[model samples]
Target chain A: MTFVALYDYESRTETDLSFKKGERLQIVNNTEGDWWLAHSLTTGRTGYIPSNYVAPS
Target chain B: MTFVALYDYESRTETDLSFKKGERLQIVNNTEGDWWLAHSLTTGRTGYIPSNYVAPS
Candidate 1:
């Protein structure tokens, strides 16, 4: 699935994907209610991202 | 790399693996000293296992 960051999110954990506001994202796993295993299109790195921080389309 | 568990270990966290003693194992990533990203051959599932609990070959 595709998503757009609502605001800039920093990497808080080892598995976090640092993303800029309004950037394109790819979701790998959304099993958790609050976290989605995703990757940034711009960075080309895979990591976990918060669901609340991005808007999915 | 190949490995075998020294003792049965229970899953402690969301990304932990509950492994049985004497099970065949595979280590995929061990960048972290305390934990290894691995899988049990019998289970066919992957997750982090503590380095202390397994003997690598």
Candidate 2:
């Protein structure tokens, strides 16, 4: 239930999640197309993130 | 140089940018695959975002 970020991301909108390098995310949902639902362990926020942006950790 | 979000995006990678509903983005680069470089007027941050997530605004 853990994944790691591949690069840096800055939030442009509220729906988007923001994180930095070496951030750990709690994988929640993977039922979407290219996007997956994840919870940020740093920010405690949950939202949809690109599947390709993360890798098994 | 503005675009609107069609859906919510969460940052799975450091390269991903976050945004929310009714948010406006200052588009900077669009010379990528399914992703584009955009700046958030609210967060004052710039990064790559999904092209399909936004439309001309």
Query: Over 4 Å off in model 2, which ranges?
Result: A30-57, B1-57
Worst 10 residues of 1 chain A by lDDT: A27-36
Q: Report the C-alpha lDDT of model 1 over B1-57, residue by residue, as the tens digit.
A: 334445554544344345555544443333322433334443343333333334433
Candidate 1, superposed: residue stretches over 4 Å from native: A1-57, B30-57
Tell me each candidate's TM-score. 0.29, 0.29
| Complex DockQ per candidate | 0.03, 0.05
- Inter-residue clash pairs, candidate 1: none
Interface Cα root-mean-square deviation for all models: 20.5, 16.9
What are the per-residue Cα lDDT tens digits for candidate 1 across A2-57? 34445554544354345445454443333322433333443343433323334433
Q: List fnat per candidate, in order.
A: 0.00, 0.00
Q: On a 0 to 100 scale, what is the lDDT of residue A42 in model 1? A: 33
